[PDB]
Structure 1
Amino acid sequence: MENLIGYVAAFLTTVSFLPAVLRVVMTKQTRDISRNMYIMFFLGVVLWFVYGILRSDLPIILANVVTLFFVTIILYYKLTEGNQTGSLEVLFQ
């Protein structure tokens, strides 16, 4: 009937969003393990740099300088974002 169809439509539309809210509210493991990757990688470029210096290998050194910029930029955006998803990007990807 018309009220029946409308409510069922309302139910289907809203509950589709339900799986997303459950994953966002959920207590999750790796907060900063994704951050830890960056930290680990950061330590790696530092040693790579020292390695490049000791052998006077400029291509290695230049690459790591650029790589150091990249990880630092990424690592500054990770630390900058603040405990909220902030986008509906979760819904789709």
Structure 2
Amino acid sequence: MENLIGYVAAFLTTVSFLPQVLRVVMTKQTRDISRNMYIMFFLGVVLWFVYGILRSALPIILANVVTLFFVTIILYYKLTE
């Protein structure tokens, strides 16, 4: 059972960044978003992805690749104003 819980948790947590991507790409506004939040989160997802490759856990690699994508675009928009 627990594995299902984990998969649903990872899915939810990864796709949650998608509406934030949508809003950032639609309104082109990033004032209220923390830069440090997405910097630290960037490095965090990077290390989770390194942990996934180190453990050859493809589901962790996938979820964190999608998250790294989302977080990267959001951070880009933040940095570029």
* Bucket of the pairwise TM-score, normalised by the shorter protein: 0.5 to 0.7
Q: Which structure would you say has the larger RCO, counting Cα contacts within 8 Å and 6 or more residues apart?
A: 2
More displaced stretch, 27-36 vs 15-24: 15-24
The change in CA–CA distance for 1:47 and 1:15 in structure 2 (over 3 A counts) is closer
**TM (normalized to structure 2)?**
0.58
**TM (normalized to structure 1)?**
0.51
The change in CA–CA distance for 1:28 and 1:36 in structure 2 (over 3 A counts) is farther
What secondary structure does 1:51 align onto? helix
Structure 2 segments unaligned to the other structure (5+ residues): none
User: How big is the shift at 1:80?
Assistant: 1.4
Are 2:52 and 2:60, in contact at CA under 8 Å, matched by a contact in 1? yes
Q: Percent of pairs identical after alignment?
A: 98
The change in CA–CA distance for 1:17 and 1:76 in structure 2 (over 3 A counts) is closer
The change in CA–CA distance for 1:29 and 1:51 in structure 2 (over 3 A counts) is same
Q: Considering only CA atoms, is the larger Rg found in Structure 1 or Structure 2? A: 1
- State the superposition RMSD in angstroms: 19.6
Q: State the 4+ residue runs in structure 1 displaced beyond 2 angstroms.
A: 1-33
Structure 1 segments unaligned to the other structure (5+ residues): 82-93
